[PDB]
Write an enzyme that holds these catalytic residues in place. Structure first.
Site, PDB file in Angstrom:
ATOM      1  N   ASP A 192      10.134  -4.051 -40.820  1.00  0.00           N
ATOM      2  CA  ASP A 192       9.448  -5.340 -40.905  1.00  0.00           C
ATOM      3  C   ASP A 192       9.703  -6.084 -42.207  1.00  0.00           C
ATOM      4  O   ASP A 192       9.732  -7.314 -42.233  1.00  0.00           O
ATOM      5  CB  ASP A 192       7.939  -5.138 -40.732  1.00  0.00           C
ATOM      6  CG  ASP A 192       7.537  -4.916 -39.283  1.00  0.00           C
ATOM      7  OD1 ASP A 192       8.343  -5.212 -38.376  1.00  0.00           O
ATOM      8  OD2 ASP A 192       6.404  -4.454 -39.050  1.00  0.00           O
ATOM      9  N   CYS A 224      21.134 -11.994 -35.611  1.00  0.00           N
ATOM     10  CA  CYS A 224      19.858 -11.418 -35.950  1.00  0.00           C
ATOM     11  C   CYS A 224      18.822 -12.497 -35.626  1.00  0.00           C
ATOM     12  O   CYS A 224      18.662 -12.895 -34.458  1.00  0.00           O
ATOM     13  CB  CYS A 224      19.825 -10.994 -37.427  1.00  0.00           C
ATOM     14  SG  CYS A 224      20.474 -12.223 -38.593  1.00  0.00           S
ATOM     15  N   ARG A 230      20.926 -10.096 -41.957  1.00  0.00           N
ATOM     16  CA  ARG A 230      21.253  -8.816 -41.332  1.00  0.00           C
ATOM     17  C   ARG A 230      22.652  -8.846 -40.730  1.00  0.00           C
ATOM     18  O   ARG A 230      23.370  -7.841 -40.753  1.00  0.00           O
ATOM     19  CB  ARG A 230      20.233  -8.481 -40.256  1.00  0.00           C
ATOM     20  CG  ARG A 230      18.831  -8.339 -40.777  1.00  0.00           C
ATOM     21  CD  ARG A 230      17.894  -7.878 -39.691  1.00  0.00           C
ATOM     22  NE  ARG A 230      16.514  -8.026 -40.120  1.00  0.00           N
ATOM     23  CZ  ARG A 230      15.453  -7.758 -39.369  1.00  0.00           C
ATOM     24  NH1 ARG A 230      15.594  -7.319 -38.112  1.00  0.00           N
ATOM     25  NH2 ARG A 230      14.246  -7.937 -39.885  1.00  0.00           N
ATOM     26  N   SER A 231      23.016 -10.016 -40.203  1.00  0.00           N
ATOM     27  CA  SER A 231      24.330 -10.264 -39.625  1.00  0.00           C
ATOM     28  C   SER A 231      25.437 -10.078 -40.650  1.00  0.00           C
ATOM     29  O   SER A 231      26.427  -9.416 -40.367  1.00  0.00           O
ATOM     30  CB  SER A 231      24.393 -11.681 -39.039  1.00  0.00           C
ATOM     31  OG  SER A 231      23.609 -11.779 -37.860  1.00  0.00           O
ATOM     32  N   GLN A 268      22.141 -12.418 -47.163  1.00  0.00           N
ATOM     33  CA  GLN A 268      21.064 -13.281 -47.632  1.00  0.00           C
ATOM     34  C   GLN A 268      20.288 -12.913 -48.883  1.00  0.00           C
ATOM     35  O   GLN A 268      19.954 -13.723 -49.663  1.00  0.00           O
ATOM     36  CB  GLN A 268      20.100 -13.589 -46.505  1.00  0.00           C
ATOM     37  CG  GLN A 268      19.137 -14.616 -46.823  1.00  0.00           C
ATOM     38  CD  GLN A 268      18.177 -14.957 -45.727  1.00  0.00           C
ATOM     39  OE1 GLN A 268      17.797 -14.151 -44.926  1.00  0.00           O
ATOM     40  NE2 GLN A 268      17.790 -16.177 -45.700  1.00  0.00           N
TER      41      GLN A 268
END
Length: 287
Positions: A192, A224, A230-231, A268
């Site tokens: 999370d 994502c 995450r990508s 990111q």
């Protein structure tokens, strides 16, 4: 090469990590901060058209024009060519990946049409549909073996395989008698907040993915939530795990730099950037 590349000798990687992570990641932080403006001077004209605004999850995550995936136009519709997605380079091709946001319910037909028109045979999903009770991705795929149409695209589940950290789903894709198999790799374990801990879970997923897909010559769809964090992490890790078989140098900085040129915010966070390094460190140390 020094500005858009920091090659590291594989045999010195443990030292480089220790050096970069020392003093609460001082050098890692400094290095990741060098990337913050990369590619941000490039126009996102089509993404900001009134007709296209509803197709973006976030006002600040927009596809670069030079780089965006273009759907086939429908003759009476303004932005029928538009989807929030970008060709992003990989180990094997400058157009190896199409990275996109998690579809909205409103854009899932566009998503499937992109899969079809790109001739993609693989989707990588790095988010749960719901996280902390917030919608991160519309479920764009069936719950059972009952075929479901999305636009002109018929999707049917042939089989699925459940693992500890991910679900593999094999789809039949049909459009008017033309028929294909597509594979869906859904990492279900991303926490999370923060990044996977231990990182090995993510490595296991990348290994299984690349093992299963081989050396694909058609675009691999990656998403994502926003299609950046995450990508980017997944792509960089997939890329370097291939790189270490064929070279004695690894260039994570250089990968991320090149990705930033093609899509905004590709890796990111600083945490994700460090995570990439930890993943490779775990590989080079035999876990």
């Amino acid at each position: 090469s020094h500005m858009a590349s920091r090659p590291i000798l594989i045999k010195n990687f443990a030292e480089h990590y220790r050096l970069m992570s020392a003093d609460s990641d001082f050098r890692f932080s400094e290095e990741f901060e060098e990337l913050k403006h990369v590619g941000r001077d490039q126009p996102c004209t089509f993404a900001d058209l009134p007709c296209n605004r509803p197709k973006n999850r976030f006002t600040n995550i927009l596809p670069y024009d030079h780089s965006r995936f273009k759907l086939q136009p429908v003759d009476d519709d303004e932005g029928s060519d538009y989807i929030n997605a970008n060709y992003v380079p990989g180990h094997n091709s400058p157009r190896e990946f199409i990275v996109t946001q998690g579809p909205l319910h409103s854009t899932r037909d566009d998503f499937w049409r992109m899969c079809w028109e790109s001739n993609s045979r693989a989707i990588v999903m790095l988010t749960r549909c719901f996280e902390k009770g917030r919608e991160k991705c519309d479920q764009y795929w069936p719950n059972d073996t009952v075929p479901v149409f999305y636009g002109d695209i018929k999707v049917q589940i042939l089989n699925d395989s459940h693992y500890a950290d991910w679900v593999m789903t094999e789809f039949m894709l049909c459009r008017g008698s033309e028929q294909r198999i597509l594979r869906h790799f859904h990492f279900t374990t991303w926490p999370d907040f923060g990044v996977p801990n231990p990182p090995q879970t993510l490595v296991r997923f990348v290994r299984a993915f690349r093992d299963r897909i081989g050396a694909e010559q058609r675009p691999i769809v990656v998403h994502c939530s926003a299609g950046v964090g995450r990508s980017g992490t997944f792509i960089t890790l997939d890329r370097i795990l291939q790189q270490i078989n064929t070279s004695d140098y690894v260039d994570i900085f250089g990968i991320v730099y090149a990705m930033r040129k093609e899509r905004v915010w590709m890796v990111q966070t600083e945490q994700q950037y460090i995570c990439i390094h930890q993943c490779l460190l775990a590989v080079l140390e035999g876990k």
